[PDB]
Write a protein that binds this ligand. Structure first.
Ligand SMILES: [Zn+2]
Ligand SMILES: [Zn+2]
Ligand SMILES: [Zn+2]
Ligand SMILES: [Zn+2]
Lengths: 337, 339
């Protein structure tokens, strides 16, 4: 069989129609027909070979909502049926047997979990992934907006799990873009007291409507100092460098500053600041198959969805440029056409 | 063909609908939609609340977009292909009646044609007469500008009618979709601004909008204490309140002005008007020139509605959000792939 895809033929290149033969389905593989595929900056990073391990032709896309079209020989009794609506996120394969995998922590597999993009992603009519990483979906989920929940959604949901966040938690979110807006929606659904930190507070009382209780300028020193010791958790979602110190001091005792933004400049973390408040600084990215399964359920039940905008896949290069130019409001989703 | 989201029956959900606009009229301008606000007048038209809806119905009348074509007679009318422009409640007027020829086109003697009726902005593209295609300042925020074309002009127009300046003392009844824009605009004009609010929990938020004072509209004695203190009071709510304390809150020569379409007729004692040389007035949307001026003023003063974004592909969710009373404070659709 041939698979029709949109591929980059060189680093930073525009995507071209590219047919490839995937060969026979591996025993653990599931083949999925793409209905929708989100785009995020990680696709751009891979297209651009920002991280140095891209291989060309490169088929990106890792935020897929689609339907099962075929099951490998060892995936025929793994809870999935042909026709079933499913999702595929950033990861497609893990080893299964290392301590991380066998304990249900497959995203941390010791061999390095395999990105979906590496075995050819969702910017295509079809893709394949290991059955463990093919996420079953709730019957009533909104499929047009669900794709980014698999990348951005799980990225901001995971710290809520790691730090045992409940409705009485006081949580701050730095950045109100693609990731930040989903974090605010999820926190609001959890009943938490939510503060957003943004660049432009007055031109974002919109953020209050998203689910924030309070909105503060992310650089305003007096505002930030006044919040000393107030927060159980502050999630950083931006990948630029800020003065982090006031945010560390805004943590209550036992509080956590948690970055899901891949800030390039290392955080400067004074031991005394950690010591004085029994504070922690941590990080994470995407989650396990179980966490993904749980998030999609929670989002469907709570009626939480990312703010998306649809592009036809036939205009995928326009869609990518839209994301590059910072125009996404807030997550671009491709519709397979 | 133009792809749109249309209601097929009164109160129905919107469905993808293609219609043929025919050849561009000589005075028309075709606009590609980038954003379109939603307000309750879209809902009233979808629901046929007023009895003159025609189905299939393409609503939407708060459009920010770009010129994609100029009619033959609209080629030298200040607009260029690619230019960012707005279309509000109105799409056409006759041009030749006393109202139109004098620069009062919204008061067209024949009835100015609503954008909806002409096929509206819940679509990839729409058309309007070039006079009603409002040019925009280069630096305006386009994502939030849409509702200025309807809600904005609605609360701006009484400021023009009553010659409001920074020395004016102005009250605003209601701090929802219309009230919040009124407060922001009045603050940008330097006025002394009082908000009359039914929700005591929103007081700090309303102060933050630009109100100098917030008064509990459910407290009869707070209102009575304000006798004779206001030059203008703008009603933005569409429910029947006791208007009398607000009439009495007007100074001599003062004005009560409703932009709320209250269904219970206002009870207006002649003696109250007489004793203070007071007036009760109303209005809705404005002329092309007033719209042009409002958008310039809003962009320069950085006044923008507080908006909530949905893609147009989620228009039925967005409409339900507005129906359920959740708008905080104006819902805007972002145009996206229409299949
Ligand atoms: Zn492993
Ligand atoms: Zn992603
Ligand atoms: Zn309107
Ligand atoms: Zn006329």
């Amino acid at each position: 069989s041939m698979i029709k895809s949109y591929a980059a033929k060189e680093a930073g290149g525009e995507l071209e129609v590219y047919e490839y033969d995937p060969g026979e389905l591996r025993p653990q593989d599931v083949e999925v027909q793409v209905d929708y595929c989100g785009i995020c900056h990680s696709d751009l990073s891979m297209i651009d070979n920002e991280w140095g391990f891209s291989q060309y032709p490169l088929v990106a896309g890792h935020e897929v909502i689609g339907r099962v079209v075929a099951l490998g020989s060892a995936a025929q009794d793994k809870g999935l049926q042909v026709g079933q609506r499913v999702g595929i996120g950033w990861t497609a394969r893990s080893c299964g047997h290392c301590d991380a995998c066998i304990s249900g922590n497959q995203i941390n597999c010791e061999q390095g979990a395999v990105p979906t993009i590496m075995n050819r992603g969702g910017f295509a009519e079809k893709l394949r992934a290991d059955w463990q990483w093919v996420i079953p979906l709730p019957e009533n989920i909104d499929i047009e907006s669900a794709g980014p929940l698999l990348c951005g959604g799980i990225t901001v949901f995971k710290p809520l799990l790691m730090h045992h966040i409940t409705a009485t938690s006081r949580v701050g979110v730095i950045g109100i873009g693609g990731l930040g807006h989903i974090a605010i929606k999820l926190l609001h659904a959890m009943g938490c007291e939510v503060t957003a930190f943004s660049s432009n507070p007055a031109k974002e009382q919109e953020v209050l409507a998203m689910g924030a209780d309070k909105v503060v300028n992310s650089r305003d020193p007096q505002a930030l100092k006044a919040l000393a010791g107030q927060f159980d958790l502050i999630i950083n979602t931006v990948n630029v460098s800020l003065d982090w110190q006031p945010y560390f001091e805004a943590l209550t005792y036992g509080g956590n500053f948690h970055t899901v933004g891949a800030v390039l400049t290392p955080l400067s973390v004074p031991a005394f600041t950690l010591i004085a408040g029994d504070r922690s600084v941590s990080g994470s990215a995407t989650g396990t198959p179980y966490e993904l399964r749980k998030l999609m359920r929670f989002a469907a039940r709570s009626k939480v969805a990312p703010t998306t905008e649809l592009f036809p896949m036939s205009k995928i290069n326009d869609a990518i440029q839209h994301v590059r130019d910072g125009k996404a409001r807030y997550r671009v989703v491709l519709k397979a056409d």
